[PDB]
Please model this.
Amino acid sequence: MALRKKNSLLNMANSYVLDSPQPSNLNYFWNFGSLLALCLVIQLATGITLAMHYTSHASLAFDSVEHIMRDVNFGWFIRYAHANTASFFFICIYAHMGRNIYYGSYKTPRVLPWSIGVIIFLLLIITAFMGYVLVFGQMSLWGATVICNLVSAIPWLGEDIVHFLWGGFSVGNPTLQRFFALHYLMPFVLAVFALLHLIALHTAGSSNPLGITSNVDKLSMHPYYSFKDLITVFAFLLMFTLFVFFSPDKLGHPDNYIPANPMVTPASIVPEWYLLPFYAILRAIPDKLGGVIAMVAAILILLILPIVDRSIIRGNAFKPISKLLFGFFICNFLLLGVLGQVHIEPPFIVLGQICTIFYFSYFLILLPMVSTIENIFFYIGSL
Amino acid sequence: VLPWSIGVIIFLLLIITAFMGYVLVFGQMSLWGATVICNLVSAIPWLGEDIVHFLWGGFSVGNPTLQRFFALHYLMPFVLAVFALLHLIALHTAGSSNPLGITSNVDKLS
Amino acid sequence: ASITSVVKTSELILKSPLLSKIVVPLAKTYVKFSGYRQLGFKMNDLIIEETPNMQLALRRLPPTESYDRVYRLIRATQFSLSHKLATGNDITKPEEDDHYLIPYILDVEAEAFEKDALDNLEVV
Amino acid sequence: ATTFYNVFVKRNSAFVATILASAFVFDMTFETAIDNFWDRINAGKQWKDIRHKY
Amino acid sequence: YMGWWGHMGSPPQKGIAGYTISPFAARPFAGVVHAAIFNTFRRTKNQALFVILPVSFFYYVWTQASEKNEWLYTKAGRHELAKAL
Amino acid sequence: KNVIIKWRGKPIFIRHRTSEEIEEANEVNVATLRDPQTDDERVQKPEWLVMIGVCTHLGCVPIGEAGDFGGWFCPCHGSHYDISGRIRRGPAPLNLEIPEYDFADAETLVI
Amino acid sequence: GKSTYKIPDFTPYLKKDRNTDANRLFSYFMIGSFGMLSAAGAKATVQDFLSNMSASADVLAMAKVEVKLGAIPLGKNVIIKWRGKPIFIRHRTSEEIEEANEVNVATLRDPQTDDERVQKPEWLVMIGVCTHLGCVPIGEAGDFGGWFCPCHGSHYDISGRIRRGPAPLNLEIPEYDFADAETLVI
Amino acid sequence: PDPAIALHEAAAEGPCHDFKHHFDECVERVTKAQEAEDYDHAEYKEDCVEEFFHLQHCINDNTADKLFRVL
Amino acid sequence: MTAAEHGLHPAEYPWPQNGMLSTFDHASLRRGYQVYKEVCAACHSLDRIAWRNLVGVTHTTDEAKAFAEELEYDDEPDDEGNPRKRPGKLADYIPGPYPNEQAARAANQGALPPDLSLIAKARHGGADYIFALLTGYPDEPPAGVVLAPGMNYNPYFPGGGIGMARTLFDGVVEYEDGTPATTSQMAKDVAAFLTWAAEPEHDERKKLGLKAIIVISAMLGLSVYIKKFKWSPIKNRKFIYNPP
Ligand code: HEC
Ligand code: HEM
Ligand code: HEM
Ligand code: HEM
Ligand SMILES: CCCCCC[C@H]1C(=O)O[C@H](C)[C@H](NC(=O)c2cccc(NC=O)c2O)C(=O)O[C@@H](C)[C@@H]1OC(=O)CC(C)C
Ligand SMILES: CCCCCCCCCCCCO[C@@H]1O[C@H](CO)[C@@H](O[C@H]2O[C@H](CO)[C@@H](O)[C@H](O)[C@H]2O)[C@H](O)[C@H]1O
Ligand SMILES: CCCCCCCCCCCCO[C@@H]1O[C@H](CO)[C@@H](O[C@H]2O[C@H](CO)[C@@H](O)[C@H](O)[C@H]2O)[C@H](O)[C@H]1O
Ligand SMILES: O=C1C(O)=C([C@H]2CC[C@@H](c3ccc(Cl)cc3)CC2)C(=O)c2ccccc21
Ligand SMILES: O=C1C(O)=C([C@H]2CC[C@@H](c3ccc(Cl)cc3)CC2)C(=O)c2ccccc21
Ligand code: FES
Ligand code: FES
Model:
């Protein structure tokens, strides 16, 4: 028996990256999983490297980031790589969640990797945010204020929790140092959860774009998907290179190159491109608690897809009506993204509310209804 | 032999972790400790001396060194927890030894 | 959702003259646009099978029907990965799109739902 | 051509040695080639081009 | 639900003969021109409406909203803005 | 004019309100106000609006003179405060907090 | 359709010269090129990336430190910081110089005479970092009454030559010049 | 002398003539409105910022490339 | 918002550094430093730039040492622990005009002139915004604009009213290379210089990106050949089914 199978440690690696039996027909949207793995590796490498140069003290943090840009050899690269990969991480993770929603990867028997995934998505948001704050530019400080005040929504104890998370009466040095600690930590927690959702997936194996069983026709993970994943690694690095080397600040907010001034917040508050959809959700709802609940619920509601999709068929390849509904849902999520960065003015206030209702009605109304009707259309239509 | 050998690496990582942690205080023993350990690479001939400078990020132990020890001291324990986990996974093939050194396959307890 | 649900609801529609008059043409068009026949599938090949109930139904298939199902799935997987469609005899013609599995899953589920019901019976 | 396969490709030791020696040559020549190219497209712009005045 | 090599959990297969040739024996880019043009056109055409319909609708919606917003903050749009607030 | 005094890292808006500003504030029926308060309750001296200039929604500092009730507008989620610094539109639930301030002299206040 | 001995038509894909060495070699050229660019790319990535840990531009500021000598009495050692490393400056007495000139150069891990070390017999200038692992030796202590590194017990001389203990070399001498007779620059 | 002065004037009389007249008309109206009494106690005071921005935005589009070509 | 509140968006000027393979024009950088030194440095600091940063960009080692050596910087205390000054060295930072924010505001009718080391990255528009702003003071504010006291009308600045007056006038600088110092020329030079200040790695970054684009393109092409090659057995797989 082959060493790779005999030896307990190798056997675990083997089962994940070499002999792992995968469906033979996964398309390029199955490549985001490995890109997110690559982003996670880049982020750890550049992140730990920035941590060797960055100073968490509020009096020095912004300056240490300038020192990284200016004085550290290749510091510019490491910094921009870290910042840009955080954007690519979100492109890839929305792509990956997109793929999963379109192909019904959330349905049995994969509800567990899906649900662990939803937590990875929340942790990524908190990691990337905590990392945003470490620059301690204007947006950084204000972002900190808002995120740490989302717990004020929680009644009674809320206000005290806020002060406890700031370690002060305002965002200041204490907050910045604890964000550094946690921003360093959170990615390792995220890598644990990323691993766990794979372990949960390993019981069912990957879904495939047809949504049928692949038990009839499996391919070893290597060499087929190893070499397939290189294509996207290099395509990703091409896009990475164009941002990192040619336009490192395209995805950034100018205001973060202003040091944090707790006395003013910029007139143009617009968070990271990837938080924009939920930020528009938060703006839409005119209640404090309401706004917060809705924003969190916009992520947590993904947890109910396993229930509300009533289809007897896995995924959307074969469901014209569901594909159209999914197209409108995705475009609405992009519209929310767009509305996140306009000014809070007519007519976009009402529009943002309509998009927020449409976002939630996909999970609560439309998906359950459409999936029910298409079940019936398949049965009647094929008699 | 495998959990043992992985263990020997955990032992080395613990030494490096706890040491890097010692340095972070940046008291007198901390700074000297840093000097000494980074100069153990000076033993390595030729490149050795350049490595020392590269590890310090300077000509001496100073700010650059302390910030990089902080980064690595935070990191090293998570690496060490991975290795601790791995040596258990390696052990799980044979199970624990016991004080008699005989097989325990005859008499196991949850 | 259960196949039983889908089948009973479909039967309610096919009973009502009005309903069938408007729904049957919709469903036939839906199935044409669905395009599973263009990979040589029968409708029933697409039913989610990673379920206790469905695994049991699939074990109940006659060897013939079972072997043919495996072939259609292998062949469709191959079309999918090549990004080709079926041509000629591989395309499922409407007359070949038989509900080979529906009787088996309906029997499996009939028993499973009776079991749930009878687990909750109250002697009067 | 068989000969070339037999020498540089058949043994993996030889193939990897050839790839790394090619990477060495490529790395050195690519650096030099881009340096010259970069100086030609940004001619008169760079410090090396105005340095002579001082 | 999925096993491993040898016991993958396929319903028993019989009667499928699978044939392939060596990667060295095949032209990896055979019919690439045909595929790149005709096959991609086929696949694009078949999916086009699923992209075009929502993109065109939400681009219309955005366009209308952005044009109204622009207009409200002109001199001409003073009155309509005063009503909106 | 409105000043910004740092106090406990939080900004303090101090506005020297004109007569007609005070009048504008005293107008709104208290009934229709998320947080029902009159200016009299807020200021201890009508000519010195003193507030903790942190928006009661999530905690940005509203940009003064902007708004729609021409007082303060929080740019973060678009909540509008009044010339009393009462919330009129947007997600903020409460009116801008008033610190404990005393006029030691008529020309100096302590916070 | 039926016979399994009639292999399906593969002529659209089959290479005629599939069995030539030229044919394999071409695909290995592709794999090897990809290995070559990966290797060039990896080396470039690692080199550039790890260079962040090398001394940053701000650290790479040089010193040039000027020290007076009028202040320093006979039989004393000063410590001047220069590039964060300490510089021992000893104002050696006549009999100290004599003591140093005695030891047969033959029996010295690092064979050097005081003449090679100092450019002026009355000014022992050394980089006061122990050549073993890099502590700063405590002066006047030792066993050769010069300097003793307390870290691993290496003894330096009045020339600052290593006599006993793990240190392999004698205490390094910086580049120093007497600009005046009363001030040296390092 | 400043190359921009000439390029801006050229672009105003030429490709941005429409916007030049709009700004001109606007200023005429606003100055006349300021001249009229009880303007200070009016609700709405008209400015010409919009027209100015239309003009400047236009001039910039027709000038940017030309200006940098002569520097 | 109204156009006023946003500021007019600056024109996109064809800077030498725009373009994937284009460096800064270093001659322009040098000229722009001279504008910073002789105009802007009166009010604006450039705190993140050290003398050494000009070396081999705009100035030789010797010229930059001369600039540093003209200034006095805080030394370590003397032997009695009394404070001392020393002449500047290349590692020293270019010193600001003002000791603190309050002194800066006092000299600028309350407004604080920002540090310019990062201003090209800190504003939408970057170089174009700086050039547009410096050159964009109209002789007369558009009719109807009421400026707050000590504000100057500049359409590019959001709100329109900027606390910085027009400062570049034809011949306020005398360039050492004989270039005609016109308002536009000085604004272009200083805008370029400030953009360099914000992103000094720019030149290196784009060159390494060029090398990366080439390598990564080739690797992407090869990776696709290799993927297709390895996958060809699966793509080319054919089935014969004989129902049992
Ligand atoms: C004597 C004063 C003074 C001089 C000279 C001066 N500035 Fe300023 N500058 C200011 C003040 C004050 C502000 C702040 C204006 C405000 O925020 O209202 C400012 C703002 C700026 C801003 C940014 C405005 C913004 O977007 O916040 C830039 C860029 C700028 N100056 C660049 C320059 C350049 C380039 C020069 C000369 C080449 C220059 N300044 C000369 C006082 C000056
Ligand atoms: C750090 C972030 C993540 C990484 C590195 C990661 C990685 C992967 C990988 C490698 C796979 C298997 C290959 C693939 O299908 O692409 C996978 C599958 C999956 N991931 Fe993720 N993932 C991450 C985040 C998420 C998130 C946020 C979700 C869900 C919200 C998710 C849900 C899933 C599911 C459901 C599968 C099974 C999909 C299937 O193969 O049909 N993952 N992931
Ligand atoms: C998922 C993994 C990570 C994500 C998504 C992430 C995201 C981010 C983001 C968005 C920033 C703001 C960057 C900027 O605009 O400058 C940042 C900064 C930072 N991150 Fe991370 N990060 C990750 C992992 C790590 C890790 C593992 C470390 C290890 C310490 C780290 C260290 C830092 C440091 C020190 C900064 C501040 C310096 C800077 O802004 O560049 N990050 N991170
Ligand atoms: C972070 C440090 C470590 C942790 C948390 C850890 C934990 C454990 C645990 C829980 C076991 C099983 C129960 C037991 O026998 O006590 C074990 C067994 C073992 N550990 Fe460790 N260990 C660590 C370090 C080491 C080191 C440094 C070595 C070897 C140099 C080592 C070698 C072993 C071996 C050989 C066994 C199998 C012993 C047996 O049960 O007969 N471990 N370790
Ligand atoms: C070294 C052994 C340790 C085991 C964990 C390491 C990683 C691992 O398992 O790699 C695999 C290559 C995996 N891909 C797939 O499953 C995969 C499956 C099907 C199709 C494709 N592609 C399609 O075309 C795939 O790419 C992957 O990228 O998942 C990473 C996230 C894993 O990292 C972790 O969870 C740990 C941590 C670094 C996040
Ligand atoms: C950095 C973290 C350290 C550990 C991470 C390494 C990879 C993750 C392994 C944890 C999951 C192991 O959990 C279990 O492992 C065994 C041992 O291979 C694997 O077992 C799998 O392959 C083996 C043989 O290859 C089959 O007999 C088995 O049917 C199949 O499930 C599965 O993967 C999983 O059932
Ligand atoms: C996996 C680990 C294995 C151990 C490998 C150890 C590698 C660490 C050594 C760092 C080497 C850096 O050495 C230094 O590299 C930089 C680039 O980084 C080169 O720098 C050269 O190219 C860079 C761009 O890449 C230019 O900015 C620079 O002007 C030019 O001189 C130097 O000529 C070289 O002196
Ligand atoms: O007002 C906001 C704001 O609302 C967010 C938001 C958007 C995304 C939110 C979020 C989304 C999803 C989850 Cl699961 C949790 C938080 C977090 C807060 C920010 O990131 C921000 C950054 C800088 C200044 C202001 C702000
Ligand atoms: O001089 C030393 C010295 O020599 C050691 C150390 C060096 C390395 C340690 C060590 C490194 C690696 C291993 Cl595998 C085992 C021990 C053991 C003692 C120190 O730790 C030290 C700490 C503080 C001040 C001075 C010193
Ligand atoms: S932060 Fe003040 S409006 Fe939400
Ligand atoms: S450190 Fe000097 S003796 Fe070892």
Summary: Chain E is about 55% helix and 5% strand. Residues 1-85 of chain E form one domain.
